[PDB]
Amino acid sequence: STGSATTTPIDSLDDAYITPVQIGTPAQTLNLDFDTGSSDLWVFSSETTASEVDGQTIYTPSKSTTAKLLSGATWSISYGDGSSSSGDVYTDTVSVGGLTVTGQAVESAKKVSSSFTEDSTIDGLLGLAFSTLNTVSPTQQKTFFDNAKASLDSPVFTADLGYHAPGTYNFGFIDTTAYTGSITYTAVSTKQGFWEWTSTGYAVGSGTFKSTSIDGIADTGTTLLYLPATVVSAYWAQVSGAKSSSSVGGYVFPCSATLPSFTFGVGSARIVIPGDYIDFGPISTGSSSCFGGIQSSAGIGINIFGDVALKAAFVVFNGATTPTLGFASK
C-alpha cells in the first residue's frame, strides 16, 4: 500500500504544517501536525477541557463505531518548546492520504497547554519518530508509520515541505519526480528515539564550506534550525545589524536586510537553504526587528534540523531494519 497527503503551512511564516487525517467511522477529519520529533498521535477531543478548546476540530470517539477505549491507558507529553498535553487513549481506524491503519492508538487530550489552545489551526499531532518515545502507559503504543510499515510497498515515508506553499507527505514510495539530482543517504542513530544523523558541515552564503560533524535530528515538528552557537554566530555575522537578543530570545536582524543562504552537508552532498527561508518576520506587529530562522541550540542539548532546513530538501525517512535518512535538492 501507499499514502499521499498534502501538508499546508498554518500561517504566512510556515510556523508549522498541517495535514488532514481521517479518524474513526464515519471519518472525522482533523488537521494534524506531523512531527518526526515525537511519537504520539494525540488529538483535541470531546474529552478536552472545554476552556482549553478555542476553534480546533475535535475527535468524538462516541460517534465512531470503530473506536474502543484502551482500558487503563493514559498519556502525557511535554515538548521542547515547553508545551504539553495529556489524556486517555482509544484505538480506532486512522487514514492518511488513502493509507489506512486499523487499531491505531489515538490519544485523546483531556488537557492541553495554552500554546495548543491558542493555535486554532492544529487539531493535534501525529508523531513519526521511533515508537520507543511513545508516552502511553502502562503499555507503550506504536506510531502510525510503525503500524503501517509492514503493509507499505517500501518501509519509508517522505517529507516534501514547501516554502510559503503546500507540500506533501508520502508513505510507502519515493516520488522520483519530486526532487532533482540524486538522494544522498546518511546513517541514523535511533538511540535517543529520534531520526538522528550527522551533517558533514556548513557554508554561509557564498563562503567556503567548513567540514565539521554536526549531530542533530530531522524534526518536522520544530519550525527553526537550531545549531551550535559557533555556527549560528558565523551565520549572523554576515548580516549587518544582526544580534542575539536575550529579551527576544534569540538572534534578530533588521527587517530591511537581505539574508545570505545557509548550506548544510549530507555526506558529500550539499543542501542550500535560501536566505528568504531564514526570515521569520517582525518580532511583534509593526516592528522593524525581524526574527531569525537559524538559532543556537546551546540551551537545548541537541541540534535540530527543523522545517527551515527540511523544507529546502526532499527528505526520505527510511524505516528499513537499519533506518537511514535521505536528502535531495528539489
Query: What cell was used for 32?
Result: 494534524
| Active-site residue, 199 included | yes
Burial class from Cβ neighbours inside 10 Å (0-12, 13-18, 19+) for residue 102 reads exposed
The DSSP code sequence of 50-116 is: GGG-SS---B-GGG-TT-EEEEEEEEEEE-TTS-EEEEEEEEEEEEETTEEEEEEEEEEEEEE-HHH
Bridge-based pairing of strands 324-328 and 314-318 is antiparallel
Judge contact between 6 and 167, C-beta under 8 A.
yes
Resolution rounded to one decimal, in angstroms: 1.2
Catalytic hit among 35, 40, 119, 279: 35
Q: List Cβ neighbours of 246 (8 Å cut-off, separation of 6 or more).
A: none
Distance CA 297, CA 262 (A): 16
Q: How many CB atoms lie within 10 A of CB 310?
A: 24
Taking CA 159 as the corner, what is the angle to CA 156 and CA 163, rounded to the nearest 5 degrees?
170
DSSP symbol at 172: S
Q: Is the dihedral of CA 170, 175, 181, 183 positive or negative?
A: positive
User: What domains are there in the chain, each with its CATH number?
Assistant: 5-174 (2.40.70.10), 175-330 (2.40.70.10)
Cα-based distances in Å from 65 to 68, 91, 258, 325: 8, 11, 55, 38
Distances from the Cα of 199 to the Cαs of 110, 138, 196, 203, in angstroms?
A: 39, 36, 10, 12
- C-alpha–C-alpha distance, residues 292 and 282, integer Å: 10
Quote the Cα angle for 223-166-34, to 5°: 50
Residues 233 and 248: beta-carbon distance below 8 Å:
no
CB 305 within 8 A of CB 216: yes
In this structure, what DSSP letter does residue 236 have? H
Residue 35 annotated to the active site: yes
Phi first, then psi, for residue 52 (nearest 5°) are -100, 5
**DSSP label of 258:** P
Q: Which residues lie below 8 Å from residue 188, measured CB to CB, with a gap of 6+? A: 195, 196, 197, 323, 324, 325
In degrees to the nearest 10, what's the CA dihedral of 40, 42, 47, 53? 130
Q: Residue 230 carries which DSSP code?
A: H
Considering 85, 199, 261, 296, which one is annotated as catalytic? Answer: 199
Cell of 281: 518576520
φ and ψ at residue 257, rounded to 5 degrees: -75, 155
Reading the block at residue 11, the C-alpha cell is 500561517
